[PDB]
Design a binder for this molecule. Sequence first.
Ligand SMILES: [Ca+2]
Lengths: 224, 224, 224
Amino acid sequence: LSEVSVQFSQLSMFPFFDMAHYLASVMSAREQAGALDIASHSPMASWFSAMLHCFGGGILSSILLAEPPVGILANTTNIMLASAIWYMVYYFPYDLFYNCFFFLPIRLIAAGMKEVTRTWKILSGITHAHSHYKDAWLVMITIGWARGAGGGLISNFEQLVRGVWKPESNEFLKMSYPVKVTLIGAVLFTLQHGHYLPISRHNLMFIYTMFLVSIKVTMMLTHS
Amino acid sequence: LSEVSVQFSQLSMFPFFDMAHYLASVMSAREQAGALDIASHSPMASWFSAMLHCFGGGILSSILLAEPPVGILANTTNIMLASAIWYMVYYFPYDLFYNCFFFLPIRLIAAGMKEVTRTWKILSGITHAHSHYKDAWLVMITIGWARGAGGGLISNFEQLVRGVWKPESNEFLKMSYPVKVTLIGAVLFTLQHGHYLPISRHNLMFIYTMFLVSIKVTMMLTHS
Amino acid sequence: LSEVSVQFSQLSMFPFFDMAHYLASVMSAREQAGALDIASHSPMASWFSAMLHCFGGGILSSILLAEPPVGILANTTNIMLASAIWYMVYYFPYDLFYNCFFFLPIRLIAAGMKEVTRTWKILSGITHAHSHYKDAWLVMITIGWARGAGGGLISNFEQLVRGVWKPESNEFLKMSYPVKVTLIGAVLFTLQHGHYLPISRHNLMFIYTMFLVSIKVTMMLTHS
Ligand SMILES: [Ca+2]
């Protein structure tokens, strides 16, 4: 019944789906070591730390294609979409905002939909690197990877923002889950647009997002 | 008597005013921790440290708009304008160069005119970000800010040049004076070019530069 | 007998000469402090460290001219040319690969030809910066320098890749041999393309490469 896979490709990420990535990347960023003291005494700095968690995929991919990293900032509807979350995640009265989304079913859905945004971002840069470079197999793996887990690759430099400098914790030295997966994804869909992979996009686009959500949902059910 | 405000807009920064910024940014850079030993044993490195103090506004703004940061270097009349100061500030015979400009009235005027150069640099990137992005409210605040206090934002990476690595001294964590002001300025003039601010440019362009000079002049009169 | 200098300009670097730079930059990179443990437990990270040794000249020069640093990556015939060496240098069975090229005559020739690749890379960016900026004397010295010893200038950030953070070991603070030479070379050939230097390119292009090889050959004969 492939007729159900076609209805998935018709999902618009701008309203509902862009914020799940913004929230799961901001909730996670706060749960990091000492990130709470940062926001209480330096509001300016915890904010930019959140933006690298959300728009680092766009930020890093812009640095790689010689595109202005301020370009991600121009989308004021997208920037303002992420910063409103950052305020309530931290500065909500009685912290009712974080207490609600931390709830396990809610937190499960919030993180599950960030994995959805991860897929189009791979295909974003894969086709976007296609624009600058037609059939460059590498360049498409990179810019697809750079948008999938950008917040985890600038993480070493994102740590340096909140004040933490751990020069021993690189991403190539030990590949984390959200990154070693986007590497796998950026390679698969590069074989899709390159037609080296025997499955349609809309069927591959749908099967990759499912393995990615079934893990993080299993991850958070066995982490709590 | 607004007729006196119009005569101010007709000020050319290329002869007299470009060097005041170059000098106040190089004099300050030398007065930094251990910057003297750097120039005595590594002339190459104290120089590039001075250039980030002077052209960091241009350097950082180039990195943000995907413009080649070597572009600030092409202006050989401007680069050579700043490096001649760096030699005499450090390597002048009997150090008569620094002893003279350190004099309080002279140092007051030298720093007062760097604040003048700060204003057009804000309007520089505000209109320059307008070129790439028409009515982007954010992008204009950024590239105006990046030219106003560029030497203070690459400062964490500029420290790493002279050898000092202080990963706890970021600019978003504690906003310094020259930076929290340029942020205020980059926002005001972004409301000017965007016509959200009820005052003409040439009247706002003149009133912002005065509050900025009356402070640093009060700063240096109460610091000595 | 200048007729022998003309036959040198007709040397194609793509087959034989591109790999000598790739090997001497990868062999040297492994001989660095703790680089062996990196490759045994983190294959991903020792690789990218090797690429900055080989394509750092292209990588850094791309960052300076606002050119996409992924552009060096698109040349799959060149990227794959360097990565095959990185595998055998490290992961060859019985390490017969490294034991052979470490042999002094072989190591002498391998390093001698990397110095050849150093010359066209200078003239590469000198004429390539000419494209973006006609008679910019500085910009041509830079982009010629950035391709000659790129792996040594991103070295501080390349160290940060393998895990080592030594903020006191900058290149402007103490100019190494491969760098203070490429600075000398990037200046000479900038006077060549600018016609401020009384010698033809093909005669200067040949005399610079000889002084560079006679040193490193004398260096490695007196180092062992
Ligand atoms: Ca560009």
